Design an enzyme around this catalytic site. Structure first.
Site, short mmCIF file in Angstrom:
data_model
loop_
_atom_site.label_atom_id
_atom_site.label_comp_id
_atom_site.label_asym_id
_atom_site.label_seq_id
_atom_site.Cartn_x
_atom_site.Cartn_y
_atom_site.Cartn_z
N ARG A 161 -5.12 -7.42 -5.14
CA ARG A 161 -3.67 -7.29 -5.06
C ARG A 161 -2.98 -8.20 -6.05
O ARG A 161 -1.90 -7.88 -6.54
CB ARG A 161 -3.17 -7.61 -3.65
CG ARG A 161 -1.84 -6.93 -3.36
CD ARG A 161 -1.01 -7.64 -2.34
NE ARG A 161 0.40 -7.27 -2.47
CZ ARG A 161 0.91 -6.09 -2.13
NH1 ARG A 161 0.14 -5.14 -1.62
NH2 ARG A 161 2.20 -5.86 -2.29
N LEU A 200 9.54 -3.98 2.26
CA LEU A 200 8.14 -3.81 1.94
C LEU A 200 7.99 -3.01 0.65
O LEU A 200 8.88 -2.27 0.25
CB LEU A 200 7.40 -3.10 3.08
CG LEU A 200 6.94 -3.92 4.29
CD1 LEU A 200 5.82 -4.84 3.93
CD2 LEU A 200 8.08 -4.71 4.87
N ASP A 201 6.84 -3.19 0.01
CA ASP A 201 6.54 -2.53 -1.25
C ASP A 201 5.80 -1.22 -0.97
O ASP A 201 5.73 -0.74 0.16
CB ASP A 201 5.72 -3.45 -2.14
CG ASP A 201 6.35 -4.81 -2.30
OD1 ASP A 201 7.59 -4.92 -2.16
OD2 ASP A 201 5.61 -5.78 -2.57
N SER A 202 5.24 -0.62 -2.02
CA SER A 202 4.39 0.56 -1.90
C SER A 202 2.95 0.19 -1.59
O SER A 202 2.31 0.80 -0.72
CB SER A 202 4.45 1.37 -3.19
OG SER A 202 5.78 1.72 -3.53
N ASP A 231 1.97 -2.39 -0.09
CA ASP A 231 1.93 -2.81 1.31
C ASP A 231 1.80 -1.61 2.22
O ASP A 231 1.08 -1.65 3.22
CB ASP A 231 3.17 -3.61 1.65
CG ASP A 231 3.40 -4.77 0.70
OD1 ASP A 231 2.42 -5.48 0.39
OD2 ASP A 231 4.56 -4.98 0.28
#
Ligand SMILES: CCCCCCCCCCCCCCCCCC(=O)OC[C@H](COP(=O)([O-])OCC(O)COP(=O)([O-])OC[C@@H](COC(=O)CCCCCCCCCCCCCCCCC)OC(=O)CCCCCCCCCCCCCCCCC)OC(=O)CCCCCCCCCCCCCCCCC
Ligand SMILES: CCCCCCCCCCCCCCCCCC(=O)OC[C@H](COP(=O)(O)OCCN)OC(=O)CCCCCCCCCCCCCCCCC
Ligand SMILES: CCCCCCCCCCCCCCCCCC(=O)OC[C@H](COP(=O)(O)OCCN)OC(=O)CCCCCCCCCCCCCCCCC
Lengths: 276, 111, 177, 86, 459, 169, 126, 62, 166, 154, 58
Positions: free
Chosen positions: C44, D40-42, D44
């Site tokens: 990540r 939140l992101d993508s 995530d």
């Protein structure tokens, strides 16, 4: 027969290494022990091959049934990477599975000895071919290795299975059969070997490093597999190799032959036969 | 370890597993006593032995089979009989190794 | 399985599918959970770097390079969920998924063994026959005149209507019969 | 090995969502969006769908994972797939 | 024999004078009874064969073909009952009359003493087959198929007439008992090699050889069904019977005029089974399998050994039964989908779990399953060929492999898989078309239980 | 059955001669098997035998008398040739059954002698090889269309070879 | 790069130079493709779940395939070199090969027979 | 019987007793038949060193 | 002797009894897997007796139960080679098959057509005991090909997926 | 059906190409007939030699277990490239190195078996001695003939 | 619960013993077994013939 059986006993053993599905591991175990039996027929000792048949039956039945208990207990999932800690959540299945693996290896009094000891004794007391001897010994080590691999990744590490636990080892249509096969895998080789009539004369006058070579090499394979399966617990990004894929894939023998041989066959069967 | 000695170094003086009675039997032996048999042919045949199995040590095998038949339950009855068969066979194997080593020491007599 | 794919398939979901399959093959290599968690955080980080580029001729080459170095570390035996393609139990119970129309050929000795079921089934079929024509009309009066179209299957707007082309979605056999 | 219900699915999904530590245990609801309502992101979202997958023991395809942006959508997807209600 | 072929003639007024509603039933039941009374000629308690007149005889090669011909008629007649059910009654009855004519003429062939009787009947069989293929076929290629199927035969058979006429002018009788006991060794000249070819390349066309087989797929694919049953079951065997009868007067020329035909049969058997491995049409797959089987019979008859003639007889009967069975099984689906394309419907065994057993058994008959009169024939002719030359097993084994392959592939891609859910017209089953497969398979089991009958002249 | 056609040496068995003060489950199971299975079965067969003997019926063998062989037969006379070919085919079938009998003898000898068979099963071996060579010099290299005339031509060629051999001093 | 495709083991979607083109001329191609796909999908569905559809669906593409592979062959067959030579080989070559194989075997066999040698110690049934 | 989520389940005495019994019976058998018959370490008989043998036993002249 | 031959034949007869009752209307009204399991158990218990007899006397019988057909000095006949190998494999196979039958009654529920599975297992065992007891080689090939097809049918049990069929 | 809906011959004109692609339900810029070597190929399209494994497994196709749709031109070789028969899917390892590794492993195995045949591993021991002239009589002796008294020694 | 035995084990054994005793052991060479493996120092049931012992070993 000697060379072919030895080739199988090496190949399927090194291919069982780096397999994740239990069922395929037991399949390659069958192929390896069967190559050992064909190696036995490579010399004038077939009755010992038949003893190994009758003893291999119990090991494989028990192993597959323990595997099936492990599988049907949870969902249809058959891969050791999601099996976890089975010594504790299934004591019965683990006990029987470990008995079966130990007896598959040349453990001295569990029906694997009563053939395999005589097998290796015969093969290092015969004048046929040295490469076959060597790779069969390596393959016995590999038997210890992948048995330890199952016992580690399935029976010793922490849980990797999903969190909804729905295990039920309690059913008399489950425990009694593996119990019978366990009494088999502990007693039947003793019984058979001490009841059959004597044939296929044994040689036993030889140094100590040949009478204990199967025990030594199985123990040493156990040690190596223990060390090498502990090596993954620590943090280090492991990489693919030119090895470990000749094992993961099956020497690329399927991935080549199963898509060239039918290719040329079917192409020649349409063109050059029908439409030509 | 007796294979290095011919495949790696000091070859062509160690014996081949074939042609083990290369030199004559009585070389160095002023007198000789031929090996004897105690199990006659009719006994050895009527006991239904196999051809690989009816060697010089067949009489103790006959004794073992008599045990294993008569005292059939208690198949653990006669282990002393199997011990005698194994001992005679070990001595036969020792005679065989003795012939090997005789021929080995004699190929060195040449040179 | 339920939603149909587009044509363009823009950059973002390419990157995300790469992220997903990379994390999965890493899980396969890093079998134990602690190791997979560590290296997943590291991955990540690798993706968070180069998250903001504004250079669609740099992000694409980053994508190509990452896919290549993924293929050179593709696990040969990755993890595959059962009931998923390439895995066990995938089409296992497909031998036990008999459709609905096979009941139309049943005898009146088996149907008598299950009367209330067929009582409901007949009115189900009646519902279908009633909604079919309006459903066809709705699909006809909503055609993209420019020509291009998708497998989007518009819904029912009015009341008394049914969402068009539903008898194969509804009535699909269960996954564990 | 018993079946699963809509309340059980909801409970398990929120159990999984109450341990990401970017979504605090509060601030969430069954209809709560991720991007607009929780920031939140993508990626995530991809991690969240992975959590659902290795929770229930099956795969969500990527094409459908791109759509799942509320926990009720997850519950609806798993409910439609596994044929829960009866 | 007269007691078998007079009732068979009486079956025709039974058709025409009966009610429209009680004509299939009566003729079917009475045909079964003809089949029953066709077992008296299995009473052979002796080595001497059964002569009933100057016209008719019956040897252990005649009798199985006789019984099978009399036994197929009810099966053809019931299989032909779903289609042409909406046909006018006169059209039905014409179909029935053609099938019964086939029965009568074929019995007369297998029972004949002279070769000219056999010739005129072997050729009279063309007219019913052509009518059935052409007036009742469903497609438009049936016409070219009829032309092919007729003219291959006639091209081969005109030289046969010339050779028989020559033999009559040379010997005087043309009867098979006398040609057996009075056969002069041949001078081994071109004038006699042409005679060999003229006598053989009528039957070799009909069996068929691989050089000449294009009539058989075009006909099997396009005949309604019952034509396909017959064309697979006894019209091909009508050439093997003739070869086995006529080869006795051609020694020693068969020792060297047979290499090309053995070789063509073997290689083209491999070619045909490879085609069967890859073929969109099911009714063509069965046909090319029939070619790949009859090629072994060609080679076997060419070798002229006891094992070989024996296995030829066994394979003849077995192939006839199982091929008729497979054509019925394909027709069972064609009567619903109305398509011969196999990959269309590929997920059965849900709807038809019992027919899917008849499928399996029909295929296991086709491939070499040991407790079966198929493998007995294939094995015995393999043993004959190995005695002949050890290098033929290399080809027979390739055939065995491909023959497992295409049969299991047929089963899989037709039954196993996911059901074609878009087929609401898969009606459950017919008791009629289940009884069909039962009547095809029960004989195979019985004959396997007693193959002492199914052998031929040599055992 | 007929122990001159199908010979069987006598089944000399050793006396039990036990050493253990313990039981053998074979013998008591044999007693139970006898007094359970063999007794009602023997009753049924004795019933069936006496019911046969109530109304006994006989059958015969059909002795076939010899006939002018084909060597006494004229080229063309189809009646004589038919009768000769028939008696030849009869003798041919009989010869196959003889060969089967001798093969059966060989197999049974091999099984009873078992392991020590290649020293005391040579009698049946030679009795098989001789008749085999006879069949080979009598019926082998013919084909499906074997006949008395073909066997005769074969015999004649072989006698010619033998004459040409014994011509040599 | 470190992957060599072949006729088998093809190149994936992940590594082709295409699948990353963001040009405006490939997009309308893919869009017309999806439009055709969706048109025929809605046709197949409107025929699938039509009640009073008692029969099956005819599937004309499969029919075109069968016709192209059955009957459209000889009309479009034109004899050429690499057709005629290929047919002559694939017809008459294995024929001749197996001819000489079997001929050599049979000749050797009858030679060793007529010399009065061959080991047929038990061959009875042939 | 019931399932349990994320926690270790209660174990029945039957399965654990049976597993312990099978494993302990295996180890009993090994200890017993290894104590008695310890002929896997080495046999009753010794592999003789041939190099130290005489040549009178072999009958060799110089 | 009668006991030996009787037991050998009785094994096959017991194993065929389930395949008989499967073709009847009595698969309902009973529990077919338990019936089959019990048949295997009784077959094992019976097979022990030939094993003990052989361990005692070592006779290696040979049976020719049925004559099938003569082919010009070739008597095809059903015949069994009841030696060491046959008995010792028969007993072991029946033991393992009894255990696998109990397991396959536990496993393989969720399958409606479990009785077909049980019947196929019995048929495999029968072909195996033919292959294992054979004295001819035609009989041995019967068992050979029977094992082959049985594996085709059981590997391809779930006939929906296109990997089991491959 | 009819003629205009069925195949034909090589189109050899742009308008015929267009009509053929509209028949086969293709994009004209994707239509590509076979190269006219002279064979049964007429206007039937050339499609990529890619198997049915490579199609999306998650998409609910109209023809499941075939990975095709009700239109969607069928490859000429849709009797070999099915899921059941042949797989041209990619591999993590390349064809060249896979074949190289496999053949090299096999060849090394053969070489080492030859090396073991010429370097056997015999226990340092003589041959077994059999008493009665290697059992001349118990192996088909012909007792009438006199034997060859070969004798062993202690 | 031995009705299972008497209806699945005894009746087939009755039929099978009938066959083996009156249609197989009647025909000549149906049942063939090896020799019963005599040993020195046993009296034989068929003739009373005593096999002598082996000459004494050292
Ligand atoms: C020594 C040498 C001896 C030879 C040994 C042969 C070895 C080779 C083994 C071949 C293996 C073939 C195989 O895999 O079996 C597939 C086959 C698969 O069938 P299935 O899928 O389970 O059928 C269920 C239906 O799908 C679902 O429908 P259902 O539930 O209603 O079916 C119930 C049952 C119903 O079956 C019946 O009703 C039988 C019909 C006859 C009635 C008998 C009347 C009695 C009165 C006579 C007077 O099955 C059938 O419908 C099939 C009928 C056809 C039976 C064919 C008999 C073959 C015997 C060959 C001998 O297994 C069988 O059932 C066939 C029977 C077993 C084979 C014979 C075993 C050897 C017996 C010794 C003779
Ligand atoms: C060096 C040491 C020696 C090595 C030995 C080399 C000899 C190899 C012998 C085997 C040759 C045939 C192999 C073909 C196997 C096969 O085709 O079956 C498997 C194949 C699919 O298998 P798979 O790749 O696993 O499927 C994907 C699932 N994930 O199945 C399929 O899907 C396609 C198969 C259907 C088409 C069959 C066509 C015939 C196959 C070739 C026949 C070979 C003839 C050999 C002749 C020898 C005897 C004369
Ligand atoms: C199915 C495959 C089984 C093949 C074995 C068949 C044995 C049964 C049989 O044939 O019985 C016939 C018997 C007497 O008739 P027969 O044998 O012909 O003797 C007179 C000669 N003309 O007449 C009778 O049927 C009545 C005799 C009473 C006993 C009934 C038969 C019981 C035999 C059961 C064991 C047979 C062995 C089964 C082995 C199966 C292996 C697949």
């Amino acid at each position: 027969m000697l060379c072919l059986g030895a080739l199988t006993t090496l190949f399927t053993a090194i291919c069982a290494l780096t397999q994740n599905d239990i069922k395929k591991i037991i399949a390659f175990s069958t192929s390896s022990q069967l190559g050992l039996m064909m190696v036995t027929l490579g010399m004038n000792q077939p009755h010992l091959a038949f003893l190994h048949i009758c003893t291999h039956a119990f090991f494989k039945a028990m192993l597959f049934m323990c595997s099936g208990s492990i599988i049907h207990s949870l969902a249809d999932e058959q891969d050791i990477r999601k099996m976890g800690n089975i010594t504790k959540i299934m004591p019965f299945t683990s006990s029987c599975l470990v008995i079966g693996s130990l007896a598959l290896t040349g453990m001295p009094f569990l029906t694997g000895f009563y053939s395999k000891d005589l097998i290796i004794e015969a093969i290092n007391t015969c004048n046929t071919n040295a490469w076959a001897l060597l790779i069969t010994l390596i393959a016995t080590s590999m038997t210890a290795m992948y048995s330890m691999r199952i016992i580690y990744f399935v029976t010793m590490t922490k849980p990797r299975f999903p969190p909804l636990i729905s295990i039920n080892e309690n059913d008399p249509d489950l425990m009694n059969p593996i119990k019978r096969l366990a009494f088999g895998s502990i007693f039947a080789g003793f019984v058979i070997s001490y009841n059959i009539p004597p044939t296929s004369i044994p040689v036993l006058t030889m140094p100590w490093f040949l009478k204990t070579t199967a025990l030594i090499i199985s123990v040493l394979g156990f040690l190596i597999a223990l060390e090498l399966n502990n090596l993954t617990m620590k943090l280090s990004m492991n990489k693919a190799n030119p090895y470990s894929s000749f094992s993961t894939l099956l020497g690329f023998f399927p991935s080549i032959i199963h898509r060239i041989t039918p290719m040329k066959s079917l192409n020649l069967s349409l063109k050059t036969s029908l439409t030509l | 370890a007796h294979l290095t000695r011919r495949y790696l170094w000091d070859a062509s003086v160690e014996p081949d597993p074939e042609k083990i009675p290369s030199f004559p039997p009585d070389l160095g032996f002023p007198e000789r006593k031929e090996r004897v048999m105690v199990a006659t042919q009719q006994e050895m045949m009527d006991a239904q032995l196999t051809l690989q199995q009816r060697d010089y040590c067949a009489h103790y095998l006959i004794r073992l089979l008599k045990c294993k038949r008569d005292s059939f339950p208690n198949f653990l009855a006669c282990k002393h009989e199997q011990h005698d068969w194994d001992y005679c066979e070990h001595l036969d194997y020792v005679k065989r190794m003795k012939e090997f080593e005789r021929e080995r020491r004699l190929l060195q007599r040449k040179k | 399985a339920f939603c149909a794919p587009p044509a363009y398939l823009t950059h973002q979901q390419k990157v995300l599918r790469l992220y997903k399959r990379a994390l999965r093959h890493l899980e396969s290599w890093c079998i134990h959970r602690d190791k997979y968690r560590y290296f997943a955080c590291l991955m990540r980080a690798r993706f968070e770097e180069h998250k903001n580029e504004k250079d669609m001729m740099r992000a694409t080459q980053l994508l190509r390079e990452a896919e290549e170095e993924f293929w050179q570390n593709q696990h040969p035996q990755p993890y595959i969920f059962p009931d998923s393609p390439g895995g066990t139990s995938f089409e296992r119970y497909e031998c036990y998924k008999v459709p609905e129309w096979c009941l139309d050929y049943w005898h009146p000795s088996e149907k008598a063994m299950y009367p209330d079921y067929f009582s409901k089934r007949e009115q189900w079929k009646k519902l279908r026959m009633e909604s079919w024509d309006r459903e066809v009309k709705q699909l006809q009066e909503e055609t993209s005149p420019d020509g291009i179209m998708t497998e989007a299957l518009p819904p029912a707007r009015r009341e008394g209507d049914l969402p068009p082309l539903w008898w194969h979605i509804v009535t699909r056999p269960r996954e564990r019969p | 090995a018993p079946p699963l219900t809509l309340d059980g699915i909801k409970d398990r999904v929120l159990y999984v969502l109450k341990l990401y530590d970017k979504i605090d245990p509060e601030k969430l609801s069954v209809n709560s969006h991720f991007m607009k309502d929780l920031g939140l992101d993508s990626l995530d979202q991809v991690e969240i769908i992975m959590a659902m997958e290795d929770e229930f023991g099956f795969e969500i395809p990527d094409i459908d994972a791109e759509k799942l942006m509320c926990p009720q959508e997850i519950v609806d997807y798993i409910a439609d797939k596994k044929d829960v209600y009866e | 024999m007269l007691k078998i072929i007079l009732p068979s003639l009486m079956l025709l007024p039974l058709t025409w004078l009966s009610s429209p509603k009680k004509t299939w039933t009566n003729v079917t039941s009475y045909s079964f009874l003809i089949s029953l009374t066709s077992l008296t000629l299995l009473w052979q308690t002796d080595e001497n064969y059964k002569n009933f007149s100057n016209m008719f005889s019956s040897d252990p090669l005649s009798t199985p073909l006789i019984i099978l011909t009399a036994w197929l008629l009810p099966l053809m007649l019931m299989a032909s009952q779903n289609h042409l059910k909406k046909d006018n009654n006169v059209l039905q009855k014409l179909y029935i009359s053609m099938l019964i004519s086939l029965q009568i003429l074929l019995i007369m062939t297998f029972s004949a003493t002279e070769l000219i009787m056999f010739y005129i009947l072997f050729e009279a069989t063309l007219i019913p087959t052509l009518i059935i293929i052409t007036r009742w076929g469903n497609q438009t290629e049936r016409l070219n198929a009829g032309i092919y199927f007729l003219f291959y035969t006639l091209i081969g058979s005109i030289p046969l007439l010339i050779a028989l006429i020559l033999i009559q002018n040379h010997v005087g009788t043309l009867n098979l008992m006398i040609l057996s006991f009075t056969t002069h060794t041949l001078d081994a000249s071109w004038s006699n090699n042409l005679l060999w070819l003229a006598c053989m390349m009528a039957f070799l066309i009909k069996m068929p050889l691989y050089g000449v087989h294009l009539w058989l797929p075009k006909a099997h694919v396009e005949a309604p069904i019952a034509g396909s049953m017959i064309l697979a079951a006894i019209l091909l065997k009508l050439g093997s019977y003739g070869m086995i009868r006529i080869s006795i007067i051609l020694d020693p020329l068969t020792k060297y005029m047979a290499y090309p035909f053995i070789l063509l049969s073997l290689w083209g058997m491999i070619m045909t089974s490879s085609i069967c491995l890859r073929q969109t049409d099911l009714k063509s797959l069965i046909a090319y399998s029939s070619v790949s089987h009859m090629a072994l019979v060609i080679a076997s008859i060419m070798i002229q050994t006891p094992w070989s003639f024996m296995g030829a007889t066994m394979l003849m009967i077995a192939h006839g039964l199982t091929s008729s069975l497979l054509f019925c099984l394909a027709n069972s689906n064609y009567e619903r989908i109305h398509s011969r394309t196999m990959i269309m419907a590929r997920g059965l065994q849900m709807v038809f779990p019992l027919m899917a057993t008849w499928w399996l058994m029909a295929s296991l008959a086709n491939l070499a399953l040991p407790p079966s009169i198929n493998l007995m024939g294939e094995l015995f002719i393999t043993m004959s060929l190995f005695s002949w030359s050890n290098f033929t097993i290399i080809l027979m084994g390739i055939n065995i492999i491909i023959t497992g392959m295409y049969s299991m592939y047929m089963i899989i891609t037709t039954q196993r898989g996911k059901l074609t859910n878009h087929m609401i017209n898969l009606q459950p089953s017919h008791t009629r078309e289940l009884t069909l497969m039962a009547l095809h398979m029960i004989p195979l089991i019985l004959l396997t239980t007693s193959p002492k009958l199914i052998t031929g002249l040599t055992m | 059955w007929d122990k001159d056609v199908y010979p069987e040496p006598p089944s000399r068995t050793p006396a039990p001669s036990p050493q253990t003060s313990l039981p053998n489950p074979i013998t008591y199971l044999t007693k139970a098997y006898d007094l359970v299975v063999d007794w009602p079965v023997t009753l049924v067969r004795e019933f069936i035998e006496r019911q046969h003997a109530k109304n006994r019926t006989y059958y015969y063998h059909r002795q076939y008398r010899r006939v002018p062989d084909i060597t006494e037969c004229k080229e063309g006379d189809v009646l004589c040739i038919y009768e000769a070919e028939m008696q030849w085919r009869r003798d041919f079938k009989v010869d196959q059954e003889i060969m089967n009998i001798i093969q059966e003898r060989l197999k049974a000898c091999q099984q009873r002698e078992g392991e020590n068979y290649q020293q005391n099963c040579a009698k049946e071996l030679e009795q098989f090889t001789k008749v085999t060579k006879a069949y080979q010099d009598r019926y082998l290299d013919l084909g499906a269309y074997y006949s008395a005339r073909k066997c005769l031509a074969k015999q004649k060629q072989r006698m010619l070879e033998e004459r040409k051999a014994a011509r040599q001093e | 790069s470190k992957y060599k495709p072949a006729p088998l083991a093809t190149l994936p979607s992940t590594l082709d130079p295409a699948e990353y083109d963001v040009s405006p001329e490939t997009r309308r191609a893919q869009v017309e493709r999806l439009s055709i796909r969706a048109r025929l999908k809605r046709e197949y569905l409107l025929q699938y779940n039509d009640p009073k559809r008692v029969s099956h669906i005819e599937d004309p593409a499969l029919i075109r395939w069968t016709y192209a592979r059955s009957a459209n062959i000889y009309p479009n067959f034109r004899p050429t070199p690499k057709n005629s030579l290929l047919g002559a080989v694939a017809g008459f070559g294995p024929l001749i090969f197996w001819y000489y194989v079997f001929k050599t075997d049979r000749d050797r066999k009858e030679r060793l027979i007529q010399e009065g040698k061959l080991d047929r110690k038990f061959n009875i049934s042939y | 019987i019931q399932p349990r989520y994320r926690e270790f389940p209660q174990l029945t005495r039957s399965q654990v007793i049976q597993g312990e019994f099978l494993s302990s019976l295996m180890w009993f058998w090994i200890l017993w038949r290894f104590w008695h018959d310890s002929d896997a370490v080495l046999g009753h008989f010794s592999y003789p060193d041939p190099s130290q043998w005489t040549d009178e036993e072999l009958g060799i002249p110089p | 002797m009668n006991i030996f031959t009787t037991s050998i034949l009785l094994i096959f007869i017991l194993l065929l009894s389930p395949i008989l009752i499967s073709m009847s209307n009595l698969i309902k009204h009973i529990n077919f897997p338990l019936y089959t399991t019990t048949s295997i158990k009784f077959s094992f218990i019976i097979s022990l007796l030939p094993l003990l007899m052989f361990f005692h006397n070592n006779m290696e019988y040979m049976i020719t139960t049925w004559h099938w057909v003569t082919m010009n000095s070739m008597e095809l006949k059903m015949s069994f080679k009841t030696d060491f190998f046959s008995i010792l494999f028969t007993s072991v196979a029946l033991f393992v098959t009894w255990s696998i039958m109990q397991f396959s009654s536990w496993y393989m529920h969720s399958d409606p057509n479990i009785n077909r599975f049980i019947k196929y297992l019995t048929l495999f065992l029968i072909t195996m005991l033919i292959l294992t007891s054979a004295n001819n080689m035609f009989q041995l090939f019967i068992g050979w090909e029977g094992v082959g097809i049985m594996s085709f049918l059981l590997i391809g049990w779930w006939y929906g997926r296109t990997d089991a069929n491959t | 059906m009819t003629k205009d809906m069925l195949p034909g011959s090589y189109p050899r004109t742009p308008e015929e190409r267009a009509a053929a692609a509209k028949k086969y339900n293709m994009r004209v810029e994707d239509y590509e007939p076979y190269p006219d070597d002279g064979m049964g190929y007429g206007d039937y399209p050339m499609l990529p030699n890619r198997s049915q494994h490579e199609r999306d497994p998650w998409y609910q196709w109209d023809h499941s277990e075939l990975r095709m749709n009700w239109g969607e031109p069928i490859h000429w070789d849709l009797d070999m490239y099915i899921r059941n028969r042949v797989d041209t899917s990619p591999t993590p390892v390349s064809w060249d190195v896979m074949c190289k590794h496999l053949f090299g492993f096999v060849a090394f195995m053969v070489f080492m078996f030859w090396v073991g045949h010429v370097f056997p591993s015999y226990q340092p021991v003589g041959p077994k001695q059999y008493p009665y002239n290697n059992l001349y009589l118990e192996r088909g002796g012909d007792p009438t003939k006199e034997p060859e008294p070969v004798v062993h020694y202690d | 619960s031995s009705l299972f035995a008497v209806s699945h084990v005894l009746i087939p054994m009755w039929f099978v013993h009938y066959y083996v005793k009156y249609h197989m052991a009647t025909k000549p060479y149906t049942i063939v077994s090896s020799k019963p493996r005599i040993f020195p120092g046993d009296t034989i049931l068929e003739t009373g013939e005593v096999i002598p012992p082996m000459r004494d070993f050292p």
